[PDB]
Design a protein around this nucleic acid. Structure first.
Ligand SMILES: [K+]
Ligand SMILES: [K+]
Ligand SMILES: [K+]
Ligand SMILES: [Mg+2]
Ligand SMILES: [Mg+2]
Ligand SMILES: [Mg+2]
Ligand SMILES: [Mg+2]
Ligand SMILES: [Mg+2]
Ligand SMILES: [Mg+2]
Ligand SMILES: [Mg+2]
Ligand SMILES: [Mg+2]
Ligand SMILES: [Mg+2]
Ligand SMILES: [Mg+2]
Ligand SMILES: [Mg+2]
Ligand SMILES: [Mg+2]
Ligand SMILES: [Mg+2]
Ligand SMILES: [Mg+2]
Ligand SMILES: [Mg+2]
Ligand SMILES: [Mg+2]
Ligand SMILES: [Mg+2]
Ligand SMILES: [Mg+2]
Ligand SMILES: [Mg+2]
Ligand code: NA
Ligand code: NA
Ligand code: NA
Ligand code: NA
Ligand code: NA
Ligand code: NA
Ligand code: NA
Ligand code: NA
Ligand code: NA
Ligand code: NA
Ligand code: NA
Ligand code: NA
Lengths: 260, 184, 163, 73
RNA sequence: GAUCUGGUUGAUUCUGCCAGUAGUCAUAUGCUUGUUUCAAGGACUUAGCCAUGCAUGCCUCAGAAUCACUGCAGCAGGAAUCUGCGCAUGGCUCAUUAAUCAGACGUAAUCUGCCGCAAAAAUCUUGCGGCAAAAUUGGAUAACUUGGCGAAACGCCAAGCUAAUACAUGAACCAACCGGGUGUCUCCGAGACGCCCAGCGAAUGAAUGACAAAACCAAUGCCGCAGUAACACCCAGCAGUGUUGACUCAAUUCAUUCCGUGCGAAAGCCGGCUUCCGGCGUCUUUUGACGAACAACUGCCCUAUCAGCUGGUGAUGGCCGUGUAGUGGACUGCCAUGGCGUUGACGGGAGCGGGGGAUUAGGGUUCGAUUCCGGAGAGGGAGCCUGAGAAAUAGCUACCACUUCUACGGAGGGCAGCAGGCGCGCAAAUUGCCCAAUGUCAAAACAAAACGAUGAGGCAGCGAAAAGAAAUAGAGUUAUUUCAAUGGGGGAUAUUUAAACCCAUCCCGAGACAAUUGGAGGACAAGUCUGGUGCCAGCACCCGCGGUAAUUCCAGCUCCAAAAGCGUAUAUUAAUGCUGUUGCUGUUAAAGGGUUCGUAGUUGAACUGUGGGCUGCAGCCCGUGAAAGAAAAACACGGGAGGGGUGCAUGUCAUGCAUGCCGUCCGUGAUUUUUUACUGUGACUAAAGAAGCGUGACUAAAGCAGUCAUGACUUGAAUUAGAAAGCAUGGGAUAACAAAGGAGCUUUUUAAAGGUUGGAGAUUAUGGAGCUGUGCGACAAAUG
RNA sequence: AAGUUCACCGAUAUUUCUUCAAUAGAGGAAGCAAGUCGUAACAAGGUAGCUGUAGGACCUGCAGCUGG
RNA sequence: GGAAGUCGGCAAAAUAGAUGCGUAAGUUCGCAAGAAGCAUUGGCUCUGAGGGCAA
């Protein structure tokens, strides 16, 4: 039904100025949700600064020069999302979309043999025709023969270049997770104990590396490794460590004083 | 046209609602089918989403299953004998779900003899599995009594005006005795 | 329509428009600093009021509070940068003693007068408006320019000026 | 809630009583609401008893809840 | 900044109102306005009527060209038409409406084009005259030509040509695994062979979709019962194991109809290598995402000179059905007599709802047609087609009210889209330029013969709404002459801009380029100045001036307040403890009912509790008794634990390539276990707006940028509050709800009588364990 | 394809009833703002005043109050 | 066509049974009231409801 998107109604995760135009590009249906996605036109023009306007952003995309998960995408309304690999072979830059500690979208540089895998969270399991088991991930993928020990909430390590799963990480006590929603988004913690309330939401308690304690809904956690030491994915610079605003304000004042 | 909304109904307090919006296409209804006995005649209806419904107008054939033996056969409908809503539907001979009908008993008698070797098979031959399955197996007298008469009561289990079929199941047990008392 | 630029007001007319004690006190300030109209004085009254209410709310209601360490040193940094407060004094109670003349001192028109470049406040006004004065090699034409203490020793004549 | 009337067939009326707070006067206010519930034959509640009800699909014009438990008196 | 002043008396102290005073992105009007930046703008009255013009179309290397089309040399560009997609979005308005909306939620009651990741083994076709194998399939229609009808009509007729990714038809062997039913052969029940049916999806019926100690008989496996997933050979582990809080759901097997709504390898189109290598496009099945429809947990104006409303005439519920995409009195038949209401139903009246704006010490009062979100409408009222989606209106049909052209036969219209008019009013712009930016659509990247549309949107004009910055000089000389500086203004190789504009930058130019609007008794700053008039003219928001000496009228001079602004009118906030919860009055100023009884409602007495010992440190069975017994526990689940802690065997017809060297975790059944409210934490909680972190856009109103030297700052864009309702959990002092009304109120110990056997199918006895009539030993008892 | 018959949704018109808001009218009644005829009240106001009621500026009877 | 006839609707016409719905001012609360007004009705073939005495 709806086809437009006003700029004021657009998500604040993007950085769009209210005084520049009335409209924002409406993402198409696809792998990721509208409210938790970054369209390809925003990445090319507003973040990488490769395109000065939206006319030049169409020249780059309709030539198939941008590959997402080892596949060209020529739609500027394509909804790229969490744990996605973006590669531009002409410029030789590879990125991964993650959340920083504050909660904003972050592009993390990657290298070869690391830009070949991605992590997917299982959200549903069902039996298809012929009695085959199928698992649905958080980005729309459908795996037709998962590990027999796979369960809802676990993380599957995928190989985008060759298209088979390589490993499985289970979700239970004593594991490393990253929060992907709420007020604690982008914080890397460690599962302590999960409360199970049938019919309602489940609450998970996590402790940071520094020892800070926090909680969030169980649907907002994403297992990424056995513990904080051996993570299976490169994280942004702060390593999911939230700092006090009082100290934060002080260092920037000192650093800028000596910046000149 | 016809609508299925609650805007024209009174509130539980007895008051009247002031309608301030026009009728929407999403809440429409359609006229009934009033299926009847006779030679087959159906008409398709395009429903929401592009799907199709088969509105049957006349039918005289259907699929009826013997639940005890877990079999089924295609037979011909003979008459309508009972309707719980109103006996004016029995007079008009309309076919709806859960109505009671009488179907042809000839195909079921033939399968009975071919399986259990009982006639209500020219040569016995080596085929003597009849005694193999006739043990620990009995047939109620009520079912067998009307099998030799020529017709057997059945219950319609499908919605003829929504799918265009009249499929059913044979009455047995306490359900059979319930309806045999009303019909007398 | 569909415009989201913001705007607000900066001054406020006084109640009781005919107080004798207020009328003569404002006339001393207007002629001492060379101001053009009473709207300049009423503008300073508004910013001074905003400073006081922030401190009074922050002073004792929240006690030692993360909302007191924050924007408790920011105001002092703001006050010390422009010169509205004494360096020795570093408690929020001492910002409540700020007066209108103190803020009026740290004006570009006043600073030029006390620096010896201009003989009188009215002469300083015409110099700034004539683009004969620059701060850090930048021409300034606004007599309301609040000079920061860091740029105090940077104010001089303009290179492009005949002076 | 509490059973209020059992004069129908496989249907009861329950009432919920609560206090509403008026901010201006800083005082409370007695209010109530009435719901129509379907009573299964497995239960035999009397007027004044306390019941636990759970939400289901529309079963009639007014019924949207089902009785799940009954506490004597 | 938590503030007041004048008026009732001859004076005085009160109650009480009137008047003064400040604000308003609140309008209108009058007199004035040098410069610049930023902005609202026919809502109010008439959801009144509208001439004219424009507002939605789309072609790439990649769906159909024989233009009787254009270049040159078959190539290229190709008008027009068929085909596929879109036109259900955007824009405008606020008439209706007590539901709609806000926060929070359900669909396990459902539909879903474009987009993402997936799946696919039915269907005897073709050529030849039984043999072959890369399927060389068929009919018709536009554009076009001919003849035309009509006054015209986004009006029409007939004949003749021919395309497809339009329409229709249709592919055997390559090519497997598995199952059900049945006829003739061999061995003694086993095997072989022949035949019928066995694909995705749909309807009906039947199963699966788990559980939580020995003898006897018939048939069976292995050496007589020790090993022991299951299974009569090719396969010796080719599923004994779906998900959820929960399912008649997912999925599998059997039977009948299927298919009697459906299902092509588009019988499709382009390139690169020398034949296979890619890029597109399309049908069916399934579930993510984007949506749609339905449902209701708490909140939501005034009115009693509106107290009863509904009632098989559907009102509340039940049964079987119909209809729907789906649940449902949504609807047909039958049955019962219910549902709502002084905690305000029903009726009447004014209003679209929020985020939010104004003002305010706190508590509050008031506004919200208008930029973002939701709802509704397109002159009024109905009905419908196409489509994934409409009860569509720059779609169709009919009626009513207006209205246009005509040759009188007939045919048309819908500006609450953008500009423009007429009326209406106290009240609101140009019949302008452009797709350069932001977006939408789509057969689509830009360039090359070769430029998609867009009154959405942008940007100029008009425009003292409102909001920032700022000109109308400066320094001296003896009162009257000396300097310097220039901005308005006029120009510029130029800059800006889609082109313009503005702005910035540079340069011929002064001491008329000359500021107004209200006042001068008091409130309230400022004349005892001078003429004229004489209760006349007039002033005066209130008190009050004028009757021949006017502090107030009409003028001159002087002075006062604000100043490029200043008066007047009408609404609103504050002043106002003059609506009083915080926080008002009631003897005499306004106001206690003539006196009682009484129902909803509001309010309601005390009690179940000093812990001790050695400001601290650590410990106590934390009154007294009595020392494993005594004052969440306890059975059972290997389909529970990536069966958790505390080279030698085993097999070998093995891809066995394997296998081993006391409290918790999970799920199930029994046992009695107490809420609400208040309070402390935690989770979840659109932007814009408000509070504020950083930053010299020359300052500011703003904005989120920027700063430093083939690039760095890993640049930055931090945080906070947001009614009520809902979720999890800790505490028990003050309270609430519910129940009773006080005479419906031992344990333990043995003895006695009774009523897993290899597996699968029947039969039997014993033993549990409970249940009674006995007997026995021990221990308590809050009342011998 | 046109065309018969029935059921359903139902514009429009006519008539009858309910509710809300406005409207004319000979003639009568009742208030407010700007010459004559009498003093009912204020002093014991020249009959002390006042409240309810009944009858004929007001007067009289009955019961009450002091605001005598 | 519809009282224009005539002193005057005199005389004639006109309404009409039963059942369902509906019904004004006024009032001595009994009435006014069959106020006024609107709808249905045949024939045929069927269905449902309404009882007694004998075990
Ligand atoms: K109402
Ligand atoms: K454009
Ligand atoms: K007198
Ligand atoms: Mg200069
Ligand atoms: Mg077409
Ligand atoms: Mg719209
Ligand atoms: Mg517009
Ligand atoms: Mg085949
Ligand atoms: Mg039903
Ligand atoms: Mg309101
Ligand atoms: Mg809107
Ligand atoms: Mg217009
Ligand atoms: Mg105007
Ligand atoms: Mg516009
Ligand atoms: Mg004067
Ligand atoms: Mg004075
Ligand atoms: Mg009084
Ligand atoms: Mg009248
Ligand atoms: Mg007297
Ligand atoms: Mg007549
Ligand atoms: Mg005559
Ligand atoms: Mg007569
Ligand atoms: Na200028
Ligand atoms: Na209007
Ligand atoms: Na408007
Ligand atoms: Na096709
Ligand atoms: Na509103
Ligand atoms: Na509409
Ligand atoms: Na239009
Ligand atoms: Na082009
Ligand atoms: Na401009
Ligand atoms: Na007020
Ligand atoms: Na006050
Ligand atoms: Na903001």
């Amino acid at each position: 039904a709806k086809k437009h998107l006003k700029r004021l109604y657009a998500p604040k995760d993007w950085m769009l100025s209210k005084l520049t135009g009335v409209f924002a590009p409406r993402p198409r249906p696809g792998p990721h949700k509208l409210r938790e996605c970054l369209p390809l036109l925003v990445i090319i023009r507003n973040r990488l600064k490769y395109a000065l306007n939206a006319r030049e952003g169409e020249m780059i995309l309709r030539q198939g020069l941008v590959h997402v998960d080892n596949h060209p995408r020529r739609d500027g309304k394509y909804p790229a999302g969490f744990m996605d690999v973006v590669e531009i072979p002409k410029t030789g830059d590879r990125f991964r979309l993650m959340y920083d500690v504050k909660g904003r979208f972050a592009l993390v540089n990657l290298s070869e043999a690391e830009a070949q895998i991605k992590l997917m969270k299982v959200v549903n399991l069902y039996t298809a025709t012929g009695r085959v088991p199928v698992a649905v991930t958080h980005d729309g993928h459908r795996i037709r023969y998962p590990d027999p020990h796979t369960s809802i909430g676990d993380t599957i390590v995928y190989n985008v270049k060759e298209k088979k799963c390589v490993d499985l990480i289970k979700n239970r006590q004593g594991k490393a997770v990253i929060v992907t929603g709420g007020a604690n988004r982008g914080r890397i913690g460690e599962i302590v104990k999960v409360e199970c309330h049938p019919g309602a939401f489940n609450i998970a308690h996590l402790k940071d590396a520094s020892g800070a304690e926090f909680a969030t809904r169980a649907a907002n956690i994403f297992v990424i490794g056995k513990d904080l030491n051996n993570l299976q994915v490169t994280v942004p610079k702060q390593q999911g460590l939230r700092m006090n605003v009082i100290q934060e304000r002080e260092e920037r004042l000192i650093a800028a004083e000596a910046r000149k | 046209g016809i609508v299925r909304s609650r805007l024209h109904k009174r509130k539980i307090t007895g008051g009247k609602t002031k309608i301030h919006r026009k009728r929407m296409k999403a809440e429409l209804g359609r006229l009934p089918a009033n299926t009847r006995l006779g030679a087959r005649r159906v008409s398709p209806v395009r429903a929401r989403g592009g799907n199709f419904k088969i509105r049957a107008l006349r039918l005289d054939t259907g699929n009826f299953a013997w639940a005890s033996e877990a079999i089924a056969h295609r037979v011909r409908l003979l008459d309508v004998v009972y309707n719980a809503t109103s006996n004016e539907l029995v007079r008009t001979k309309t076919l709806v779900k859960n109505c009671i009908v009488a179907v042809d008993a000839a195909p079921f008698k033939r399968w009975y003899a071919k399986h259990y070797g009982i006639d209500l098979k020219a040569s016995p031959k080596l085929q003597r599995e009849w005694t193999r399955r006739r043990r620990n197996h009995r047939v109620e007298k009520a079912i067998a009594d009307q099998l030799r008469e020529g017709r057997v009561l059945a219950r319609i289990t499908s919605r003829p005006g929504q799918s265009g079929r009249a499929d059913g199941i044979l009455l047995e047990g306490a359900e059979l005795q319930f309806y045999l008392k009303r019909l007398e | 329509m569909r415009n989201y630029n913001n705007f607000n007001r900066v001054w406020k007319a006084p109640r009781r428009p005919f107080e004798k004690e207020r009328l003569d006190r404002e006339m001393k300030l207007c002629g001492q600093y060379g101001l053009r109209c009473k709207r300049e004085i009423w503008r300073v009254n508004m910013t001074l009021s905003k400073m006081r209410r922030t401190a009074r709310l922050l002073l004792t209601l929240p006690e030692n509070h993360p909302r007191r360490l924050l924007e408790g040193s920011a105001i002092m940094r703001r006050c010390h940068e422009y010169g509205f407060l004494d360096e020795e004094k570093d408690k929020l109670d001492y910002v409540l003693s700020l007066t209108v003349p103190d803020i009026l001192e740290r004006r570009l028109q006043t600073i030029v007068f006390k620096a010896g470049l201009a003989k009188s406040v009215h002469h300083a006004r015409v110099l700034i408006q004539q683009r004969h004065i620059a701060v850090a090699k930048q021409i300034v034409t606004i007599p309301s320019f609040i000079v920061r203490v860091s740029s105090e020793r940077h104010i001089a004549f303009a290179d492009a000026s005949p002076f | 809630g509490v059973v209020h009337s059992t004069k129908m067939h496989r249907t009861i009326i329950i009432r919920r009583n609560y206090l509403h707070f008026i901010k201006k006067y800083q005082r409370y206010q007695k209010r109530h609401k009435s719901l129509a519930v379907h009573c299964s034959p497995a239960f035999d509640p009397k007027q004044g008893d306390e019941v636990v009800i759970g939400q289901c699909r529309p079963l009639s014009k007014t019924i949207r809840y089902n009785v799940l438990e009954v506490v004597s008196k």
